[PDB]
Symmetry: D2
Subunit: 292 residues, 4 copies
């Protein structure tokens, strides 16, 4: 059983980024020169995934027009004779990668977004990648997680040791450590108060899910708006079969926050061949007072 | 004669920002949490301008959907009970500000973009603002320039002392200094070699133009694609009436370049009440090695 | 004072055409092979008008994409070598015609839509054309009305004799005939009861307005939703200066109704070079029974 | 093995409908008050199909916005208190129906569009429905064809008797009749000359295909542009397993042609609750002269 598909929820309101996210989801925010969602798709590609399923909401066109062919932009590029840039634009969606679109009509949360993709995933394991968790890993984090999935044939939840006083911001897993970095999960709890959290292992926006999850999602009684909690479906699933938590190696930038977006911008600029040296020299010599 | 209108060319390919500008013009790039074009519109508003004319090209919808009312986003905001954010979203286009759209069908340069707006400006003086020149001024730069225009009733070209070896990147003005910061222009030349440049005063993306400019634009024989050089029209205009260069005070970020975009991000983050303190402490303590 | 501008309110919900108008304004409905709004723009062009001002609302993109350039459609035509269809596509917006867009954020009616366009019209007389009134006239109706305006330099209201029992569907004018088909208006009333209507001359969706109309729209007490009844502004205007009603020659199809749209389709098909002869023969021989 | 999925190629350039199809695919053309593609989706729904796969090209947004939720149109309906029109709008995409989108970046024909959808169909039989073939059948034609598929578990090709001199416009099947209206196919040929055509049974835009078809599409030598002739893949398939042609009962309108579109408009108008009686009376009494 090989994972060839990834589901990307890309209806991010980005309240912490208004007004920038007025007309585009937060997953389209650029880090230096590349949208968050493209980093995420490239991470999926590095894990062997070739079918990208985008679950869109408002401003779907920012996502669609990013990955779909643009005749007008290739015209402008061809007209300016910019041949390297032409191939850069084509590489956003290589020929062997497919992009499919499905709608989440109402912003009803992650579990609902996953369930919307059910009949596009079919009877197949699949990745779920939240692009506002920007991850740097060697190899990429989803590639690490596909290694785990290929070995154990169990769902894999990406987790990270987080500060004990911040457990109210994370889903928190419980279980016994198995091998290095792998926890056989006995439970998952959504945003526990620090004094009740069963561990310091918080869920990050990376999952490999076996298709049985859809069955458990469908069984949940929804909330007020109709929200389905993916955590409740995961909790229900591990009662029936093995579910693993994987402590990935790498660095996370929480680009659901402006601070994390700024850290990501700084770190990736300093790795960017076009600007790294000049940007470092700028940080070293900048004046503290902005003159108007 | 009061300036109530501003023309914003917003068909920026952003070759230096591909792939981020695949589906949105470079003028929509965010600085922390606000698109460049919104900074520019706010600068025009600070100068008393109330009619915003956007000259669009590819991906016009990123611009239109930013300034036009969104029913879906206000629905999401109302559904989440986020009332301060609701007013933030409404303030993108205050009730007393109008936004009009006109097309530049082909990317044929700035003079062509200005001429496309002729019959929307009418027989009125108007501002031209290039949003990828991000300016910080107290008061804002266009407000400074409208002060000059209201006093002299002559076109005003925003200029800046630039390094002598970089004159090939700028239009360069010539003339006699009049009062503090004001040059009565005798000529303007597009991108001269350093050893021939008549001054070190380079044109930045800010203009106040009297409507006679349209006549001079129309008189120009176009280039290969049909490009019209605004510089040639300005050169032609000053032969007939007074045209002034204004040395504004403030700081410019060249956000047509990735480096300038990064400097702008850093400087405006350190002024941003939500992140300034944490971002400074991050810059002070960050590790030099990114761990994968 | 020549009329060079026309205002086209194109926020038509087409409740009578749902679900067809789900994602497109009713003014984009095709008559045989051409949208209603393109018939209206061609009528304006025949009257010498060269600036088209579209007051958009919901689904603005169907209108914008129709009149703006499309590279992808021209790439598909180019790839199929289909040549005459290129001149046809280019003819949708000839080089000497400008298209400008302004938003009516809330669908508040015709008088309000006219006021939204004020700063695009400036201090100029202008046509107002409701495209869901499809008019066939030789010469075109707006061309007839501009001839009237050029002769009298007064606002012109298009009218037609309507059945006496239908006056509650129309604005109804009153006055005295002055030359063949020209009424010097003494009054206008919005939707009178038949037994109270002062004439049988009902207003159709064609106007030539002098810019004094904007001051009269502002003087109006708004309706409960904020509507400004254009009829009441015309009533106010004619107290200060001459306003004329013009009994145009030609045929109207009320394409605000499904029945008028079908009649229009039949009549224009029977004049269409490609289908007229074959469609008439089909209407002559068609079987009344539809086999299922 | 039930058919739950239908593939709708909707990249139709509608060269015969320009300029109407400038900004909208021909499959969005309305018949009275409903787009062709919605008739096609309703026919699929009547056959028990619940996953609609749209293979888009140029102007994908007209198709997407038709089937996806619109908050602004529902806000305008809500503000006008128009209630039954809400159920009508919601009925465009009922809760139990999923809409998925895949791109055909280059307009390379039907067989190629079917292969583009392969990974959305998976290992499942599927319907293929060309919406510009408007079919009226009681029960609907795809419902008739699914009954055939459920009975024989073989691919089903929709066919109709066509005039012998028109075979160069059709794929033409050959075989032996097996039950009323069912032909066990021995061959199929794309557009034979009349004197060479093996039958008068022409293929219409309705198919039920088993997923073995994808392997046969891949085995085909591509056309000069990269096209894959679906007819040749069906010819290849029937050498390995049973393929049936089904002579449906009902009436076809070729809405790839302006004349068929007009006939469809007339016939469906004459069955429409709101206009049938009044439209028939207009056709009976209409004057042949159009007054200008």
């Amino acid at each position: 059983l090989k994972v060839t598909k990834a589901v990307f929820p890309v209806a991010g309101l980005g309240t912490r980024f208004l007004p920038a996210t007025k007309a585009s989801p937060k997953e389209m925010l650029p880090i230096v020169d590349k949208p968050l969602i493209q980093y995420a798709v490239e991470e999926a590609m590095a894990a062997g995934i070739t079918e990208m399923i985008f679950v869109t909401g408002r401003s779907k066109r920012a996502i669609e027009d990013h990955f779909d062919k643009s005749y007008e932009i290739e015209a402008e590029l061809q007209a300016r004779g910019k041949d390297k840039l032409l191939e850069l634009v084509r590489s956003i969606k290589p020929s062997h990668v497919d992009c499919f679109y499905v709608r989440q009509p109402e912003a009803l949360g992650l579990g609902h977004a996953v369930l919307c993709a059910e009949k596009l995933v079919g009877d197949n394991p699949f990745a779920v990648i939240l692009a506002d968790d920007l991850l740097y890993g060697t190899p990429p984090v989803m590639a690490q997680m596909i290694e785990v999935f290929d070995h154990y044939h169990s769902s894999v939840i990406g987790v990270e040791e987080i500060p004990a006083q911040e457990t109210k911001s994370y889903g928190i897993v419980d279980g016994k450590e198995w091998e290095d970095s792998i926890i056989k999960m006995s439970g998952i709890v959504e945003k526990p108060e620090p004094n009740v959290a069963p561990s310091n292992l918080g869920v990050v926006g990376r999952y490999v899910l076996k298709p049985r999850i859809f069955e458990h999602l469908r069984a949940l009684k929804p909330g007020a708006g109709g929200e389905l909690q993916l955590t409740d479906a995961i909790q229900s699933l591990l009662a029936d079969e093995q579910v693993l938590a994987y402590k990935y190696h790498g660095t996370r930038f929480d680009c659901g926050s402006k601070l994390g977006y700024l850290k990501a911008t700084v770190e990736f600029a300093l790795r960017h061949p076009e600007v790294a040296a000049d940007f470092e020299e700028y940080l070293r010599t900048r004046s503290p007072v902005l003159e108007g």
